[PDB]
Amino acid sequence: FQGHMLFISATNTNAGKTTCARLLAQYCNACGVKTILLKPIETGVNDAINHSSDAHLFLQDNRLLDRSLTLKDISFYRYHKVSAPLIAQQEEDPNAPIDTDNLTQRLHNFTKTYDLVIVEGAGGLCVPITLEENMLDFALKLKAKMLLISHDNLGLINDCLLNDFLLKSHQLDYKIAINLKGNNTAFHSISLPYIELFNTRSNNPIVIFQQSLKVLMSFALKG
């Protein structure tokens, strides 16, 4: 068995990566698709004090599959500073640059025992991890598939398209999904019309996450 890998990134931080990741994993696992959730690099955390980081939320979902799992098993580079990882690393752990080769082995390792390995990035695509590498670079090195989450507010069109432009310029499979809040009545009149229009002319349509679980599972497992 060789399992599949889905990288999850976003238009920016605080866009819905974590929530959507969980929602997708939940769906997959319910359909009998054995799915683990990973947050390899995380910043803005203090694990002595609080247990509500993305890695912690992931850990508790993952433990429904493998109770022996621990935080250190699914998250590897963790910093207090609320910043890009590179900046956090340099300040808090100067002698230990983030090793993407290491990270890759570890993420791939999970594909040996899981049908689907979901990997949450940090912040957006151009967020720097090392002197030489950013999150997009990392996703490419992993040879993973890309799910890019967008916010659902005024300004999403610009953000989606900027990211579309960057992604389509690189050799990877990707989908862009909008994280639509249920109570967001404005979206369907304000943004959705351009998205519809954009989709008629694009071979890589932008979908609405909450309405695309089945479609996105398929995408994730395609090969």
Ligand X SMILES: NCCCCCCCC(=O)O
Ligand Y SMILES: Nc1ncnc2c1ncn2[C@@H]1O[C@H](COP(=O)(O)OP(=O)(O)O)[C@@H](O)[C@H]1O
Residues annotated as catalytic are 39
**N- to C-terminal Cα distance for the chain?**
13
CB neighbour burial string for 35-74, b if at least 16 within 10 angstroms, e if fewer: bbbbbbbbbebeeeeeeebbbbbbbebbeeeeeebebebb
* Mask for 45-74, x = binds ligand Y (CB under 6 A): ---------x--------------------
- Considering only residues 1 to 20 of the shown chain, the ones binding ligand Y according to CB under 6 A are 10, 13-19
User: Would you say 115 or 120 has its CB closer to ligand Y?
Assistant: 120
User: Would you say 55 or 217 has its CB closer to ligand Y?
Assistant: 55
Is 140 marked within a binding site? no
CB of 110 to ligand X, least distance (A): 23
CB of 168 to Cl ion, least distance (A): 33
3-class secondary structure, 118: strand
CB neighbour burial string for 7-33, b if at least 16 within 10 angstroms, e if fewer: bbbbbbeebbbbebbbbbbeebbeeeb
User: Would you say 14 or 46 has its CB closer to its own copies?
Assistant: 14
Q: Is 184 in the site for ligand Y (CB under 6 A)?
A: no
